[PDB]
Amino acid sequence: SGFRKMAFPSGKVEGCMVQVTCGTTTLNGLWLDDVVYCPRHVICTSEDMLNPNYEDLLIRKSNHNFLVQAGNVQLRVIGHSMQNCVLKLKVDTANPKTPKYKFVRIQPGQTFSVLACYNGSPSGVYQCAMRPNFTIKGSFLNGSCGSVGFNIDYDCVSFCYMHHMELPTGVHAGTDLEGNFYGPFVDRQTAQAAGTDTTITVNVLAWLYAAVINGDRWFLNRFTTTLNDFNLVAMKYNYEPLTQDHVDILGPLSAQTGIAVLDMCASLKELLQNGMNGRTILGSALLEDEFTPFDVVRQCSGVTFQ
Amino acid sequence: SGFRKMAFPSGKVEGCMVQVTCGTTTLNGLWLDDVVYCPRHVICTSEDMLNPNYEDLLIRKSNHNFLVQAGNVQLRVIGHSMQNCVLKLKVDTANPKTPKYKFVRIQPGQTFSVLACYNGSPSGVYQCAMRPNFTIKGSFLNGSCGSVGFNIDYDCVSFCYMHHMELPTGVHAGTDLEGNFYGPFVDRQTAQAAGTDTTITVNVLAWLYAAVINGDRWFLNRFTTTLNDFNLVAMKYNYEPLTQDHVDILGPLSAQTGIAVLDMCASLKELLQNGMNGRTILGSALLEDEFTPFDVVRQCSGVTFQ
């Protein structure tokens, strides 16, 4: 019993973290096989970041201008290329600690673990959700760029996020491992609108099922609702509209608890309209939306990894 | 910027996790040098747990009755001994992945990371506090026994907790690595009173300083207080009494923010008496007490580990 925001074990990702320096800028890189992936803004100074022409800046850089260090050993850079907002530095040695991996572009609402790094060294690990507005609410200081987000499936690491920047609002933005930003963000020091953030309705419902499983049931009511009726309430509270795909995904939790998805929706509707009245659910005084249905089942089943 | 409940990178601890089986009972063990540490209740059946005589049960077990498996390799057990509530199984091979380590007995209020394991395999990592009543609020299913709690200081892992049981109330109990329980708990299936839990006042204050550092300042008031005056309010709300040692420990955060500790105490007093009025602090609708002053500074400075 008990429900916690759990991150994946970070061991396989720690073995891939390297320090990348170009000029006076140092950040983190990800060493997989004979390639080191890192944000392309490693080639910029603080002044370049106001309006960088990455193509022109990269032309003035040669392989020897990139210093890659894994622990205390220096890797020899024999190739460099820019793919969207990421730099791929080809090194002469394959990482002997390269785990089985995939590069994946996650959907908004999905979750992943972040291994926050500074100077190529890990400092901590935490679980994040890709918000519907394609930002993340992480913990990232200067030098954390290049830290990655990932999921583990038994022995396979699916990398999905690379940290690039903090918006003036305090939230974080980054790319997938092909260097494509999540959201409309660009890698430059300019004010950028993230847009209205909405609550991940399917995740709040999954967390309500995790609550019932762990004995927190005060919020269960004698009401039911319809998809269109619940969505009228969801639109008023800036919650993502619920679809039959989301209902289908909640099927296993509904079968386990004996509570129909539309009955859980009615309970959520009452919590939205009336608040929590000074009560808590799984130790929280607000509705949590950072657990997918897959996170709830994984945690309640104790699925393990290599 | 941003503030998260961050766990230490778990890589050094993953390399130490093994599966220990005795009869039909399987749980996790910690392999450091040529010794495997695990809960002594690995020698029990479900029926033995009602009133176990560990000494009599252990006498019927020989080295060959303990199956220790690290990944797919079987370790040869050449010695066994019981130290308080832990079994120490001497194996013929030292763990080649043994990190630099220490065994430490933490104080109530201090924090640590838990690497939840099943069958010797890691499933996840999260940060916990040792509550003032010596319980932890973790996430532990059947088979999670033997999972450990730890802290990292650069290259050194200080193990402080080994999971032993879940109380009928849903909270968790365990030992230090010498097998001494934290709290008055015993390793038997009997109802056990954890006692009144109190809020870690020094940690709530440290988290209020983390809030100010990250721009959340609505709660700052025009009042001050005294230690005895604040403690009258602390006793009413089941908060740990604040001492000059706690004030001394908050010194660096007070010097960084320019906010005197007694002024932060007055703000906390107003939050306790008036509530949060539907507002949030660092994304939470309640007062968080699972961050020590050392966790706030470490996170705000980005201290890294090996």
Ligand SMILES: *CC(=O)N1N=C(c2ccccc2)[C@H](c2ccccc2)[C@@H]1c1ccccc1
């Ligand atoms: C994420 C990160 O560490 N850093 N990101 C920036 C940045 C991103 C977008 C717009 C402006 C700045 C910082 C930076 C500073 C100078 C050159 C490139 C990036 C910041 C950082 C700080 C120190 C070293 C590397 C990166």
Ligand SMILES: *CC(=O)N1N=C(c2ccccc2)[C@H](c2ccccc2)[C@@H]1c1ccccc1
């Ligand atoms: C922590 C854990 O996995 N387990 N703890 C107990 C336990 C502890 C205290 C009192 C009763 C039971 C479970 C257990 C069951 C049978 C024998 C010993 C311990 C439980 C567990 C489940 C499966 C394998 C090992 C341990």
